[PDB]
Design a protein around this motif. Sequence first.
Motif, PDB file in Angstrom:
ATOM      1  N   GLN A 136       0.822  -1.204   0.000  1.00 31.29           N
ATOM      2  CA  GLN A 136       0.000   0.000   0.000  1.00 31.29           C
ATOM      3  C   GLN A 136       0.858   1.257   0.000  1.00 31.29           C
ATOM      4  O   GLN A 136       0.501   2.262  -0.625  1.00 31.29           O
ATOM      5  CB  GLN A 136      -0.938  -0.017   1.204  1.00 31.29           C
ATOM      6  CG  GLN A 136      -2.262  -0.706   0.937  1.00 31.29           C
ATOM      7  CD  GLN A 136      -2.112  -2.205   0.758  1.00 31.29           C
ATOM      8  OE1 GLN A 136      -2.373  -2.741  -0.318  1.00 31.29           O
ATOM      9  NE2 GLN A 136      -1.698  -2.890   1.817  1.00 31.29           N
ATOM     10  N   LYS A 137       1.990   1.229   0.708  1.00 32.43           N
ATOM     11  CA  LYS A 137       2.853   2.404   0.769  1.00 32.43           C
ATOM     12  C   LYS A 137       3.525   2.676  -0.570  1.00 32.43           C
ATOM     13  O   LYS A 137       3.632   3.832  -0.993  1.00 32.43           O
ATOM     14  CB  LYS A 137       3.893   2.232   1.874  1.00 32.43           C
ATOM     15  CG  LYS A 137       4.879   3.378   1.979  1.00 32.43           C
ATOM     16  CD  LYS A 137       5.451   3.471   3.380  1.00 32.43           C
ATOM     17  CE  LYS A 137       4.422   3.997   4.365  1.00 32.43           C
ATOM     18  NZ  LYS A 137       5.044   4.339   5.670  1.00 32.43           N
ATOM     19  N   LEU A 194       0.674   9.485  -5.245  1.00 35.39           N
ATOM     20  CA  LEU A 194       0.840  10.845  -4.748  1.00 35.39           C
ATOM     21  C   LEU A 194       2.023  11.572  -5.373  1.00 35.39           C
ATOM     22  O   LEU A 194       2.181  12.772  -5.126  1.00 35.39           O
ATOM     23  CB  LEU A 194       0.996  10.837  -3.225  1.00 35.39           C
ATOM     24  CG  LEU A 194      -0.248  10.481  -2.410  1.00 35.39           C
ATOM     25  CD1 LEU A 194       0.144   9.812  -1.107  1.00 35.39           C
ATOM     26  CD2 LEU A 194      -1.090  11.721  -2.151  1.00 35.39           C
ATOM     27  N   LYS A 195       2.851  10.881  -6.157  1.00 39.55           N
ATOM     28  CA  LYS A 195       4.014  11.479  -6.815  1.00 39.55           C
ATOM     29  C   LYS A 195       4.983  12.070  -5.791  1.00 39.55           C
ATOM     30  O   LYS A 195       5.407  13.222  -5.890  1.00 39.55           O
ATOM     31  CB  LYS A 195       3.591  12.530  -7.844  1.00 39.55           C
ATOM     32  CG  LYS A 195       2.715  11.985  -8.959  1.00 39.55           C
ATOM     33  CD  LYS A 195       2.354  13.073  -9.955  1.00 39.55           C
ATOM     34  CE  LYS A 195       1.649  12.500 -11.170  1.00 39.55           C
ATOM     35  NZ  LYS A 195       1.314  13.560 -12.159  1.00 39.55           N
ATOM     36  N   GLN A 211      -6.798   2.267  -7.938  1.00 36.49           N
ATOM     37  CA  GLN A 211      -8.118   2.853  -7.727  1.00 36.49           C
ATOM     38  C   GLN A 211      -8.432   2.954  -6.241  1.00 36.49           C
ATOM     39  O   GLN A 211      -8.936   3.978  -5.765  1.00 36.49           O
ATOM     40  CB  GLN A 211      -9.185   2.024  -8.445  1.00 36.49           C
ATOM     41  CG  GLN A 211     -10.359   2.831  -8.978  1.00 36.49           C
ATOM     42  CD  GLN A 211     -10.138   3.327 -10.391  1.00 36.49           C
ATOM     43  OE1 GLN A 211      -9.470   4.338 -10.610  1.00 36.49           O
ATOM     44  NE2 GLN A 211     -10.703   2.620 -11.361  1.00 36.49           N
ATOM     45  N   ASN A 212      -8.138   1.890  -5.492  1.00 35.30           N
ATOM     46  CA  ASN A 212      -8.389   1.892  -4.055  1.00 35.30           C
ATOM     47  C   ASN A 212      -7.524   2.921  -3.337  1.00 35.30           C
ATOM     48  O   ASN A 212      -7.990   3.598  -2.413  1.00 35.30           O
ATOM     49  CB  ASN A 212      -8.145   0.498  -3.486  1.00 35.30           C
ATOM     50  CG  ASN A 212      -9.206  -0.497  -3.905  1.00 35.30           C
ATOM     51  OD1 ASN A 212      -9.031  -1.706  -3.757  1.00 35.30           O
ATOM     52  ND2 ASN A 212     -10.314   0.006  -4.433  1.00 35.30           N
ATOM     53  N   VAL A 213      -6.258   3.044  -3.739  1.00 35.38           N
ATOM     54  CA  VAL A 213      -5.367   4.009  -3.099  1.00 35.38           C
ATOM     55  C   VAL A 213      -5.815   5.433  -3.405  1.00 35.38           C
ATOM     56  O   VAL A 213      -5.768   6.311  -2.535  1.00 35.38           O
ATOM     57  CB  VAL A 213      -3.911   3.758  -3.533  1.00 35.38           C
ATOM     58  CG1 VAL A 213      -3.015   4.895  -3.080  1.00 35.38           C
ATOM     59  CG2 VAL A 213      -3.417   2.438  -2.967  1.00 35.38           C
ATOM     60  N   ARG A 214      -6.265   5.684  -4.636  1.00 34.90           N
ATOM     61  CA  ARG A 214      -6.796   7.003  -4.970  1.00 34.90           C
ATOM     62  C   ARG A 214      -8.030   7.325  -4.141  1.00 34.90           C
ATOM     63  O   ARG A 214      -8.218   8.469  -3.713  1.00 34.90           O
ATOM     64  CB  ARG A 214      -7.118   7.084  -6.461  1.00 34.90           C
ATOM     65  CG  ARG A 214      -5.909   7.265  -7.356  1.00 34.90           C
ATOM     66  CD  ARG A 214      -6.324   7.414  -8.807  1.00 34.90           C
ATOM     67  NE  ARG A 214      -5.337   6.844  -9.714  1.00 34.90           N
ATOM     68  CZ  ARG A 214      -5.416   5.632 -10.244  1.00 34.90           C
ATOM     69  NH1 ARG A 214      -6.431   4.827  -9.980  1.00 34.90           N
ATOM     70  NH2 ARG A 214      -4.450   5.216 -11.057  1.00 34.90           N
ATOM     71  N   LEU A 273      -7.583   9.348   4.106  1.00 33.24           N
ATOM     72  CA  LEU A 273      -6.904   8.315   4.876  1.00 33.24           C
ATOM     73  C   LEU A 273      -5.446   8.147   4.475  1.00 33.24           C
ATOM     74  O   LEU A 273      -4.683   7.523   5.221  1.00 33.24           O
ATOM     75  CB  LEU A 273      -7.634   6.978   4.724  1.00 33.24           C
ATOM     76  CG  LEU A 273      -8.745   6.651   5.726  1.00 33.24           C
ATOM     77  CD1 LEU A 273      -9.824   7.721   5.737  1.00 33.24           C
ATOM     78  CD2 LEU A 273      -9.345   5.292   5.420  1.00 33.24           C
ATOM     79  N   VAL A 274      -5.047   8.677   3.322  1.00 34.11           N
ATOM     80  CA  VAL A 274      -3.655   8.706   2.893  1.00 34.11           C
ATOM     81  C   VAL A 274      -3.315  10.144   2.531  1.00 34.11           C
ATOM     82  O   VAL A 274      -4.039  10.781   1.758  1.00 34.11           O
ATOM     83  CB  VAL A 274      -3.398   7.762   1.703  1.00 34.11           C
ATOM     84  CG1 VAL A 274      -1.985   7.939   1.185  1.00 34.11           C
ATOM     85  CG2 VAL A 274      -3.634   6.320   2.111  1.00 34.11           C
TER      86      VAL A 274
END
Lengths: 102, 64, 171
Positions: B6-7, B14-15, B38-41, B48-49
């Motif tokens: 995930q990281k 997030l670039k 898609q989930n991370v976005r 949450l991120v």
Amino acid sequence: QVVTRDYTIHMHKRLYGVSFKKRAPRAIKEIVAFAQKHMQTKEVRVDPSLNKEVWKRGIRNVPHRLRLRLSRKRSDEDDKALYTYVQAVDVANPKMETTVVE
Amino acid sequence: ANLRTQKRLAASVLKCGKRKVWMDPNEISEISNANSRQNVRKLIKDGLVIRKPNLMHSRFRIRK
Amino acid sequence: VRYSASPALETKCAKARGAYLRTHFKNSREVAFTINGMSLKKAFIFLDNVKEHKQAVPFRRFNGGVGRTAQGKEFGVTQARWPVKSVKFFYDLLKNAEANAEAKGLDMDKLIIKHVQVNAAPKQRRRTYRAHGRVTAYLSSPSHIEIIVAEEESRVSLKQGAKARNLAARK
RNA sequence: GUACGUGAAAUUGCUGAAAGGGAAGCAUUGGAAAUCAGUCUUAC
RNA sequence: GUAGAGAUUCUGACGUGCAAAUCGAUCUUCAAAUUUGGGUAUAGGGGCGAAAGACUAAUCGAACCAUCUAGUAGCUGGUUCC
RNA sequence: CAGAUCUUGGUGGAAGUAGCAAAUAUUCAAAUGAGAACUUUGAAGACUGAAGUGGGGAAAGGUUCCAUGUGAACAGCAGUU
RNA sequence: GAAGUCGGCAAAAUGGAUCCGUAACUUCGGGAUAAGGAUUGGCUCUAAGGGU
RNA sequence: UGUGGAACGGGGUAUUGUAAGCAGUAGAGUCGAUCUGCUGAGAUUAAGCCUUUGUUCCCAAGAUUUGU
RNA sequence: AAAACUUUCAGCAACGGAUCUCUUGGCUCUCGCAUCGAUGAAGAACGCAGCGAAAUGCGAUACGUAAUGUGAAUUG
């Protein structure tokens, strides 16, 4: 049983001569031993803010005295864990006596 | 438990660097469920991120 | 597989086995020799004390270089250690033996460690690299352990006969 | 019981016995302790 | 004087090493007879050598491989029951 | 066969001994879990400090990439990685 | 303050920059950073040195 | 369960050299190195210093081995 | 000076794989036969099965097709 007290710890005397690269880890261990001897509980949780304040001046320079708040909390998950929670207290001068917090 | 995948995804989305990636430590279960970009976005949209700000390198003393 | 000792008669005993356990055979032997003969409950108290550094396992045979301690004086020895890996294995086997006694219907109050033996298990072997391009052995010495818990623990000549008669009976 | 027929020795742990004041082993003679066979009981 | 290329001294560390040649400090050179990648040529009584008998895959006063070969032995060692 | 620094294989005493000491350094809480000095997340303290411990390629390797799963074995402690 | 030691081996000392000063000798190029001296912070100031 | 022990606090002793803050008819000058007062102050002080009518806390326990 | 420890002996249990028994293998002898390839050999490479890595077999007709024989399997 469940009781909350403020103490002042003489970290200067307990760190005298300690290797510079173990000063802050030794300070944390002295906090744990200090809490165990006072509240008679082997389980001691150190507040992350207290850890932050111990490590505030680097690994080599620990404050000569710290004002600690020790709470002999019963438990969260276990029935009779009876652990000590230790946190930092911001005061003008740590050179003061032990008090019992309501 | 493990959030290394995930990281790496969060840093890419997030670039920024993985040093600049922040995950809400109180949402580990939902972050671990997030397994795609898609989930991370969606996590970044939900807050949450978070991409943390750069460290401070002020030039005040240099200008003075 | 059959055990070493004449006991393990299942009417009044229990036993438990462990094979190919990856822990030092020398440390296991010292633990076994220390706990051999004490009651099962007191054996548990001793093992937790060793885990907590309140009591120590005396090192009698494999004692080369072992440091001195004050916790060996109750065994009349100077060299003693606290092997936690070996004690953890022995704790698991003793719990297994106690469970076997429970299912078998024995009495936990009176159980004692009647027999405990450690044997050398086959070595697994590894490699270590030395100076000058040399390689040698990094062997591992596992142990077989077996425990058994249980309960409790002339003709006379003619002259001699005549002498005996005339002395005892006649008087 | 697949770490699988049989399963020796080196070497190892347990048990029983024994021995031991800077080696041990051996030979000889007997003691002690354990162990055991022959013989006998019969035949005439 | 840096990178880079070297390897003077401590006869330091290590010396069953991190290492079958390394590490630390010190030191030599640092714009040319310079350093170096890849391609290519030279092969064993031969090559190549600003020359030390140096180097030629940890092998060099004649590389390595396999055969002749179980080479030869006035020399050393061993050579099995009563 | 008792010998040949015999051959092959096996196993000892040394010995739980030498040792696991280069490269500044970790700490607290939580999560997971049978099990956490070592896994993950957050917080703190640090270092490489652009001739990097960064981002890439060539030679060489060959699937080591990626996700999921994990009794061992391997990672000279540990291990849920 | 080299008495150490086969030997100053190791260590120490010196060290940047500015100004002054600089021997023998020489193949006239050097030697030379020869050797020897002095100076160096912070702050408030001016003095010059460019473009339209 | 005591002129008990501990953790701190107070006092002494010692080390350093007058802390931070604020104030000034001090300061070359065109805001400002620094100086002065409070200020032998402040910090540190047993970690193998001394002392404490102080403050808070702890202790009448487990295990183990032993007979003339 | 009792225990520990060390050594010895025995029992049991380990470690190890000797011994005994076996053997679709090897070795030696004899008998018989004569048959590779440009009409592509020997060898090599990569592939081919419902589930196969190797060995064995085969070549995109790929653990095989045709034809002949047997006669009801293959088998995890």
